[PDB]
């Protein structure tokens, strides 16, 4: 059964993805800057928990995702959820050099990352990524294409998905052409953007190790949903 996704024009694909965007959630209204494992991870967990619900409904709205079997959708989300939370975080933090905008009322710096053994390194990785996005002048339309690619690519190796991925490549190019880039500039930018996905993968993997560690420590409460998403990485 032919997928509706491949019949979309570039502009339509872009509209679909922009429209599917989850909202930016707030953290608790307590203005206490977190300076402890308990405080920080408490707030990060709560936020991640709520974002997950929006992420699940977002994924259903990514063209082609719906054509997948339920099991395949589950696998892709299980593989990709942290990469997706993280690229979102990096995107939100762009206009805030040196800062991570977990929420509009929750900006953490690296000095706060130091409050969790092993966290500052991941904070530094995220900040370098945000800085990279910013110096590249990453656009919203480009961001949504990248997030969709992560969804579809990350669990793929563990044909429809590949065609959809190509469609998204076509859409990224369309956007750069629309923005006036030369041919050389298009393929170079495409390459640059996609290479950052490697680093996003890396940050997810390291973060996952950290969350498992925290899980075992067992002070920061984890929701059943987060536990299942985490357990999926074994």
């Amino acid at each position: 059964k032919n997928s509706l996704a491949l019949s979309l024009t570039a502009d339509q694909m872009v509209s679909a993805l922009l429209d599917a965007e989850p909202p930016i959630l707030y953290s608790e209204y307590d203005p206490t800057r977190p300076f402890s494992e308990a405080s920080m991870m408490g707030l990060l967990t709560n936020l991640a928990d709520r974002e997950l619900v929006h992420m699940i409904n977002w994924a259903k709205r990514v063209p082609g995702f719906v054509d997948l079997t339920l099991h395949d959708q589950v696998h892709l989300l299980e593989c990709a959820w942290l990469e997706i939370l993280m690229i979102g975080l990096v995107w939100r933090s762009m206009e805030h050099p040196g800062k991570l905008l977990f929420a509009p009322n929750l900006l953490l710096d690296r000095n706060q990352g130091k409050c969790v053994e092993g966290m500052v390194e991941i904070f530094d990785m995220l900040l370098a990524t945000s800085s990279r996005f910013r110096m590249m002048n990453l656009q919203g339309e480009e961001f949504v294409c990248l997030k969709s690619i992560i969804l579809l690519n990350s669990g793929v190796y563990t044909d429809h998905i590949h065609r959809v991925l190509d469609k998204i490549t076509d859409t990224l190019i369309h956007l750069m052409a629309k923005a006036g880039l030369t041919l050389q500039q298009q393929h170079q930018r495409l390459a640059q953007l996609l290479l950052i996905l490697s680093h996003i993968r890396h940050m997810s993997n390291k973060g996952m190790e950290h969350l498992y560690s925290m899980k075992c420590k067992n002070v920061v409460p984890l929701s059943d949903l987060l536990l299942e998403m985490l357990d999926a990485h074994r």
């Binding site: 699940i56 989300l77 299980e78």
Partner: peptide, 10 residues
């Protein structure tokens, strides 16, 4: 029995 199994349907 995964929560995700349920949420993806709803």
């Amino acid at each position: 029995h995964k929560i995700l199994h349920r949420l993806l349907q709803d």
